[PDB]
Amino acid sequence: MSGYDRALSIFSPDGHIFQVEYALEAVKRGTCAVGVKGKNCVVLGCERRSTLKLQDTRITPSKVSKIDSHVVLSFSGLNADSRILIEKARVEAQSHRLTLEDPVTVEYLTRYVAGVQQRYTQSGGVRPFGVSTLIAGFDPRDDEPKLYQTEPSGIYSSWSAQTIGRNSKTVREFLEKNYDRKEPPATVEECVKLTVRSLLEVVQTGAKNIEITVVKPDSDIVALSSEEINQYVTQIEQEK
Amino acid sequence: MFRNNYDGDTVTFSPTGRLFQVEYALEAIKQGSVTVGLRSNTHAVLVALKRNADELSSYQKKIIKCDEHMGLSLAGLAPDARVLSNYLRQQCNYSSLVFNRKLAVERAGHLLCDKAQKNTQSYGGRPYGVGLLIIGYDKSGAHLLEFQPSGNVTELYGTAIGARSQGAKTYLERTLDTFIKIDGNPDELIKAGVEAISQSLRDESLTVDNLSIAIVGKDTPFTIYDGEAVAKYI
Amino acid sequence: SRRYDSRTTIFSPEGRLYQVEYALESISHAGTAIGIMASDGIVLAAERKVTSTLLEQDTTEKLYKLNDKIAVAVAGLTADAEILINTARIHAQNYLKTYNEDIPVEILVRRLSDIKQGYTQHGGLRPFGVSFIYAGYDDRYGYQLYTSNPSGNYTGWKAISVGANTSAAQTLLQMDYKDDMKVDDAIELALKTLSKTTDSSALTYDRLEFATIRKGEVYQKIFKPQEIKDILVKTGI
Amino acid sequence: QFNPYGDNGGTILGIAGEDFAVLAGDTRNITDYSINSRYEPKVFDCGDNIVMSANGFAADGDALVKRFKNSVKWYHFDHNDKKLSINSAARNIQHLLYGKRFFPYYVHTIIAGLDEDGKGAVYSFDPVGSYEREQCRAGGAAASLIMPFLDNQVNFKKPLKYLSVEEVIKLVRDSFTSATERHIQVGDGLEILIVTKDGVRKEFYELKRD
Amino acid sequence: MNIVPQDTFKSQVSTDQDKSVLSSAVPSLPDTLRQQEGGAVPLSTQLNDRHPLESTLKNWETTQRQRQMEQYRQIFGIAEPMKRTMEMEIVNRTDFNPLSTNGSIHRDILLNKECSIDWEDVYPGTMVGDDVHSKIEKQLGI
Amino acid sequence: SAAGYDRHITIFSPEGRLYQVEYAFKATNQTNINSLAVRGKDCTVVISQKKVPDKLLDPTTVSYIFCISRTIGMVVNGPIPDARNAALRAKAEAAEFRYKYGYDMPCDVLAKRMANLSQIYTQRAYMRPLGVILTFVSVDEELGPSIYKTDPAGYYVGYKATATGPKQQEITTNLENHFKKSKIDHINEESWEKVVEFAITHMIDALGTEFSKNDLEVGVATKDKFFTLSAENIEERLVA
Amino acid sequence: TSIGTGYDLSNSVFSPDGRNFQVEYAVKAVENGTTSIGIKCNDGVVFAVEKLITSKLLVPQKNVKIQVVDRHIGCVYSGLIPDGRHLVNRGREEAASFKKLYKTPIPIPAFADRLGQYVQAHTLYNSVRPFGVSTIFGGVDKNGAHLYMLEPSGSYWGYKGAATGKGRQSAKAELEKLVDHHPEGLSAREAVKQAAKIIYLAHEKEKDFELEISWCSLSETNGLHKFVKGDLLQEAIDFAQK
Amino acid sequence: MQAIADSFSVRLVKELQYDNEQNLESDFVTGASQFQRLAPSLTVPPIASPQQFLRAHTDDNPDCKIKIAHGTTTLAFRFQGGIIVAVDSRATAGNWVASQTVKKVIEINPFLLGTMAGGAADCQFWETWLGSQCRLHELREKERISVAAASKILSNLVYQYKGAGLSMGTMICGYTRKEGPTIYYVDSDGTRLKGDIFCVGSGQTFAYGVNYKWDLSVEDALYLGKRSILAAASVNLYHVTEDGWIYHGN
Amino acid sequence: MFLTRSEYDRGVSTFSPEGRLFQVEYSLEAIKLGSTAIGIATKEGVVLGVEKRATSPLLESDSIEKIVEIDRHIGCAMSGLTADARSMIEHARTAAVTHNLYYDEDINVESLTQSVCDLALRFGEGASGEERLMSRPFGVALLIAGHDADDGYQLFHAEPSGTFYRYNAKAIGSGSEGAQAELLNEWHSSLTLKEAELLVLKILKQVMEEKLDENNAQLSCITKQDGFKIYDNEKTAELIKELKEKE
């Protein structure tokens, strides 16, 4: 603050841009999202706010969106900005496929999303997207899992396991204690169980507020139903 | 205290009638090192003291060639000096390409003044903050000009700009009759310039690393001496 | 807060957007609107903010037809709502022209919500101070009820209310709504909720707007004041 | 429709020696059957020991040479007065020619100089930028006469590698004299530019003026 | 002092001439998907077989305005065209209505078209990129 | 005091007023000069007070009366730079009307056009209103003698007779008294010299001071031309 | 009040009294400039300027404080040097354009109006600032001799005698006395002598200055602007001293 | 606002046409930005029918005709060891002497080869440009570009100028880890055709007698390509493997 | 004589009373917020070395890219904001590739550095007179190591102010002060490539809070023959073990 936080183009005397930090603060208020990659899959987990009694649930949008048959995306922050970002990412994926005959790689799409977010910080007449994204998938004709995190400032990074959103510090500490990079979960079931147990550290109600999506090579994307998540939760509770 | 309320930009006058941003841009010149220029009826010379970030770094280039018959030295903001030098090169190139002419030094001074005045009356930009010394030789002989970024140009026999340039300027003014008649002897004029710029040294000595010379003349194209080429002048 | 609410493109130190919050707050000053989805139709009801008897009632301030399958209830500024309604009608006709098929409800809702979100990201634009209740039918999901707010977020509902008395109306709907409800029961429930939540002494016909989307095909019916009086007499209000 | 092209037919010849290069051209400038001038040079020193000629429509060739020389000036400004090599000049000229792909210069271009190892080098260009390095090339109206003379005189017959500058100059002069005797558009004068490690030297000889 | 518009033909072409639809994978090439022109429209086809009156009609009003400005410069001085252009720039710059295409009242007053109608007024007139955000990006140049 | 952003731009105050417009109105009285306009049977007369106290000024270059077209004359109350700006704009407008519609521009139409421009100034944030009051006089081919007035607010209206300046109230009261006595809206005279003399006498009576030939400017509009009198003409008119 | 608080931080803003304080501050900037005077004689104009003595390093013939807009128009200014140079360049452009268009030298009133419109246009928007110069210009045309003075607000007037700068009050008093004592008129050479005298009186605290005098007269310079040569300048200086 | 004044303040520059930035750049007035464009700028005549103008002025005495590439037979085929490219090397004769061997195969990069047909200048210029684009792509993505992407880039480029006058037919051959060996054919009509065996030029029918199997050794494949070229008729041979192209010569 | 707030350090186009532009100073502070990078130039090549600073162990260590290749003969190390560096690296690669396309030769290291600095100038007027492109100056500094035939091996330091220097040895980032102080004493003109690598590793170990190993540090070199190459983890680990044994 102190008069240095009223514009995107103002450096702080200690070399900070406070509006970026405030966009991160906006991101911190969204529901928690987790991404964990195993030996042969990537699992994205999301926290869902408890559905109201009169709220319809058949057409409610999911927290995990399919950018392309091999790349998926989850977010934390402002829900309305995420739709714009997802639409732009899907358009870019189709455009790249048309221009080069080849589907995008995960890193390329992450860089494009980060570029859009960076562009929306380069004018005093525009507002940055208050969204942090997790992009997961597999490169075409490849079997190495890819997981990336993108921030409102336009910075992106590559992680073995990452959390964003509300109460993400506790989930990150749990993952750091219970994840080993040299020995990742060798099966889909282990990765899903680890993701669910990480989400259970901050989800109050339990199974009904957890969404799990699994991505495998060769364009294999599966959204787990409530019954499977409930079974995982019950098994975790019994083993506890 | 009251100045603090009327120095926001270049489109604001103070209640006493002062334009403070232009004054600050002019003050920015003294943050640069000293450069000296002089001339006679046949040659014009620039002498520059260069500075380095530390012992592991190189020295800054203070003399820039604009055309085979004209060059300049700078003191002040580096980006402004870069912009103005490129602009002068473009104008000389245009003159040569379109008219097969050598651009006059006075024309270059007028163009620089016109370009610099615009930034001092409109919102959005800032005034330039570099002073320039332009030497050249054309159909009117040898010319030395001093450019101030407020949009001012003066024609002089000799001058100095930058930090502690007052001593060099006083020495040049005192010995005007000496170097005003050094015709056909470039070495004597260069030596006079070196002595003048030495008059502005403070706990420093000229070396082959921090001294730069430039000369233009009747049959001498604009030539820059650095390193060992100035060793005989030390 | 006063140093971070003059413009729509600046985040607060806590990450809040005050202009969007003020636009959301402005919705509470509008007349109540209610949408109820039954097993065989959708009912839209609304209360006018009429203060004089010199107002024409026969000739629509809360209910509009986007197309033969989709209608909306409005809570907020009327002129911004009319701008968005014309835009939605044009979009629906464009979809019909391009694909030779009726536009799905969710696509239209998402388009309008994207427009309203975009109006919160440019410094020269203020947010639309309106909330919409969309009632529609399509061959993909059947009957659908949606709500959109100034922030650009939209939600799906079975029974929903917007406007001045949203909390009490939602409480009553939660206490009274059933999944297997019929259109007539939905009409009675909406009327009773409006009567209970009204700040006026009585819920007369001239302070009401009513609409129903049902089947014989799918038919839209915007009730006339005489039909509103007849249903009010039938219910017992 | 207005026709923007013309023809000022002349003859040029470039030859690469062991450690030298030569570029020669006739100085006759003509229109149809009239003589515009009897000494109008077409071979120019472009700086950095590079000689250039663009034979054909004279205005297009003059424009191309002017653009190349201005580009060389900016190259010296932007790269600490670095010397422009002959291959880089050939690439620049290819780009300049192809920039007019849909409105081409009506010229044939030859450049000559010394390569990085000091050997003589000659580059020939098509009107839209296709270029190649060659030992010898003649262009213009009398090329089909000049080339057989050189082929009979030299083997590419003392080999070209062991010829001196004076012998090459004599061969060029003899070939141009023969072409002047046989071709109406060739005559008046011949100008030769020689590029060696010491620089560029000019020589001029008279030809038949009828 | 032109009456019929002149210098309407293009002198240079390139694959990146339209900066607003450049591909992100290959920045030197255009993005055909976001062009939304049918996908089979090379730029070269726009250089030939045009109706001869199209360029005259498209640039007519600008040509008349430029002639008026030149007359003002000749008769009144530099200040009059400077002020007219400044007023027009100020009016056009602060108008941003992504949901409308009609011109402003103040622009019509400045253009002396308060009570004038032409066919451009009568006839003022996708899958990808026809939303508010595209207009925001074009307006802000980001 | 405007007390807000209205200190600079034309936006509504909490009372519903535009302070910049009112301040331009206040600026209209800077010169401390009064002007009068009256209508004859077939002529219109405008008289403007001239104050040149400085002895170094050239009086012949001091004028607030402008010739807009062949038949239209204008008198301006306010500072001379804005007056000259408005004069050039009005000349251009009249010429453009003649070019576009094939007949000479009427005085009232020109007044309405200038009023619309002033409305633009009142509504646009980055445009300031001109601090002048304009009075156009002519003999229209359809309406006869015509006086119309426009102000910085964008308001324009026609008058039987008008007065503008710091002492306009007394002149207006005297005009109202004379018109009530005569029970007509115009001056019953056949020559414009008599109308000029009557207007001079009215100005002298209203201001309570005597005027010489150098203290006034007179403009006369007939059905043929609008023309400004010189010093000799005014001196001749004074002798009566 | 000379300081309008709350209404002086942006150009093109009206104060509650209807004043524009940025233009007034530009006037204040003008009032601190060097003293310059202009006198209108029977058939011409004379301009006089006081100069501070600078270093000997300046080239004597390349430092002229009186600008020639056109062969028949002379001009001096007080205030900001770059603003004066910009205005003189604009005036030269306007004169050249008029002469090209209508085959005659531009009349002084038309030139004055074009300059005044250009200056006034800079008091209309907040993205620019008013010029910080007051300009005294003049010349000879087919209608006779004309002398004008132009202010930062864009207001200009024709003058019998004009003065600007720090010593404007004393110069104006001397000009008023000269006008009073010569109801019939004044000649060009007498105008030169009086201009020298007025500059000397206005200067009088660092008694070291030079004097520049230019004139345009139908009888003397055939209606052309010329600087005063050595003999006449020396005579004027001697008359001013004695 | 002062920029507007400069725009309205004054002829000579207008006649020189140097008030336009493109003209200043093309003549190197303000610098060398003309030599800094990733997408080249191509001049067209400012008339209603540029295509007719070019076609009329190209199909008509001196040596200033547009050079045409050799119509000689070229063969490309793919096998388990990579790609074999064979070109009948018989240079034409003119009023010039060659300093060295003339290459009818463009080396786009140490991993990509192209074949010339139609306009020599078009092929050379656009394949050098394609090499620049591929280098930039590989720098950005930190991985070697696939043959499909490069062929598609060239195809889109030539399609943007379709009908303007370009004449070229090329074979892009490359060996990547993901795709294996790959051959595409791209011409100025915009066609982009993936294939196993390509024979282009005069005598293509005779050279299409390729005895072809996906189990040929490197020596057998080279011999088969040489024999096919000889049947079509020296021969220039190229063997493209995952590590790049190797020039044999025969 | 009263204390009042001054606001000359907020606008990038506003001068201080003494002629400073404090937004550039604050951009330099933002650079100092970054991690350490060190370059040492010898006659056998130029060595670059960076510290990999990871906030969490879950971050992929093989993902942080503070050293990039601009061209086969030009490499770069960055310190500061990553997105600004990404834009600058894209511009530098485009410049090198385009110069090769138009001149059929490698671009000089100093020419590429000048092009990057001209890009960095874009928060004001451009070097050729272009209009403003950026709202704020960059918040990242670059170390450009190259080899050309004209000037041998070169190391340049490029700043957001648009000015570059030539250095025999340079350090940027959080630990730049102590690292530069050590460089001033430990550099000489007769250093070998191996000695330069060992010195870079030693200085990185000195100014690193964490224990130096292959995971949190990265090395790279440029030589005339091999070009620009970033060392793998095994070679850096061997060099670190050798340095430990020597010390």
From Swiss-Prot, chain B:
It is found in: Cytoplasm; Nucleus. InterPro entries: Ntn_hydrolases_N (IPR029055), Proteasome_alpha (IPR050115), Proteasome_alpha-type (IPR023332), Proteasome_asu_N (IPR000426), Proteasome_sua/b (IPR001353). It holds the Pfam family Proteasome_A_N. GO terms for biological process: proteasomal ubiquitin-independent protein catabolic process; proteasome-mediated ubiquitin-dependent protein catabolic process. Keywords: Cytoplasm, Isopeptide bond, Nucleus, Phosphoprotein, Proteasome, Ubl conjugation. The modification Phosphoserine is found at residue 14. It comes from the Eukaryota. SUPFAM superfamilies: N-terminal nucleophile aminohydrolases (Ntn hydrolases) (SSF56235). There is a cross-link at residue 191 (Glycyl lysine isopeptide (Lys-Gly) (interchain with G-Cter in ubiquitin)). Belongs to the peptidase T1A family. Present with 7210 molecules/cell in log phase SD medium. The proteasome degrades poly-ubiquitinated proteins in the cytoplasm and in the nucleus. It is essential for the regulated turnover of proteins and for the removal of misfolded proteins. The proteasome is a multicatalytic proteinase complex that is characterized by its ability to cleave peptides with Arg, Phe, Tyr, Leu, and Glu adjacent to the leaving group at neutral or slightly basic pH. It has an ATP-dependent proteolytic activity. This is Proteasome subunit alpha type-6. It comes from Saccharomyces cerevisiae (strain ATCC 204508 / S288c). The lineage of its organism: Eukaryota, Fungi, Dikarya, Ascomycota, Saccharomycotina.
Swiss-Prot record, chain C:
Coiled coil: none annotated. PANTHER family: PROTEASOME SUBUNIT ALPHA/BETA. The keyword Nucleus applies. It holds the Pfam family Proteasome_A_N. Present with 17100 molecules/cell in log phase SD medium. This is Proteasome subunit alpha type-3. PROSITE patterns: PROTEASOME_ALPHA_1, PROTEASOME_ALPHA_2. It comes from the Eukaryota. Signal peptide: none annotated. The 26S proteasome consists of a 20S proteasome core and two 19S regulatory subunits. The 20S proteasome core is composed of 28 subunits that are arranged in four stacked rings, resulting in a barrel-shaped structure. The two end rings are each formed by seven alpha subunits, and the two central rings are each formed by seven beta subunits. The catalytic chamber with the active sites is on the inside of the barrel. One of its GO terms (cellular component) is nucleus. There is a cross-link at residues 97, 196, 224 (Glycyl lysine isopeptide (Lys-Gly) (interchain with G-Cter in ubiquitin)). Keywords: Cytoplasm, Isopeptide bond, Nucleus, Proteasome, Ubl conjugation. InterPro entries: Ntn_hydrolases_N (IPR029055), Proteasome_alpha (IPR050115), Proteasome_alpha-type (IPR023332), Proteasome_asu_N (IPR000426), Proteasome_bsu_CS (IPR016050), Proteasome_sua/b (IPR001353). Belongs to the peptidase T1A family. It is found in: Cytoplasm; Nucleus.
Swiss-Prot record, chain G:
Its main location: cytoplasm. This is Probable proteasome subunit alpha type-7. The alpha and beta forms are probably products of the same gene with different post-translational modifications. The 26S proteasome consists of a 20S proteasome core and two 19S regulatory subunits. The 20S proteasome core is composed of 28 subunits that are arranged in four stacked rings, resulting in a barrel-shaped structure. The two end rings are each formed by seven alpha subunits, and the two central rings are each formed by seven beta subunits. The catalytic chamber with the active sites is on the inside of the barrel. The proteasome degrades poly-ubiquitinated proteins in the cytoplasm and in the nucleus. It is essential for the regulated turnover of proteins and for the removal of misfolded proteins. The proteasome is a multicatalytic proteinase complex that is characterized by its ability to cleave peptides with Arg, Phe, Tyr, Leu, and Glu adjacent to the leaving group at neutral or slightly basic pH. It has an ATP-dependent proteolytic activity. The modification N-acetylthreonine is found at residue 1. Belongs to the peptidase T1A family. GO terms for cellular component: nucleus; proteasome complex; proteasome core complex, alpha-subunit complex; proteasome storage granule. The keyword Acetylation applies. The keyword Membrane does not apply. GO terms for molecular function: mRNA binding. It comes from Saccharomyces cerevisiae (strain ATCC 204508 / S288c) (Baker's yeast).
Curated annotation (Swiss-Prot), chain I:
It comes from the Eukaryota. InterPro entries: Ntn_hydrolases_N, Proteasome_alpha, Proteasome_alpha-type, Proteasome_alpha_type_5, Proteasome_asu_N, Proteasome_sua/b. One of its GO terms (biological process) is proteasomal ubiquitin-independent protein catabolic process. The modification Phosphothreonine is found at residue 55. The modification Phosphoserine is found at residue 56. Its main location: cytoplasm. Keywords: Cytoplasm, Nucleus, Phosphoprotein, Proteasome. The proteasome degrades poly-ubiquitinated proteins in the cytoplasm and in the nucleus. It is essential for the regulated turnover of proteins and for the removal of misfolded proteins. The proteasome is a multicatalytic proteinase complex that is characterized by its ability to cleave peptides with Arg, Phe, Tyr, Leu, and Glu adjacent to the leaving group at neutral or slightly basic pH. It has an ATP-dependent proteolytic activity. Belongs to the peptidase T1A family. This is Proteasome subunit alpha type-5.
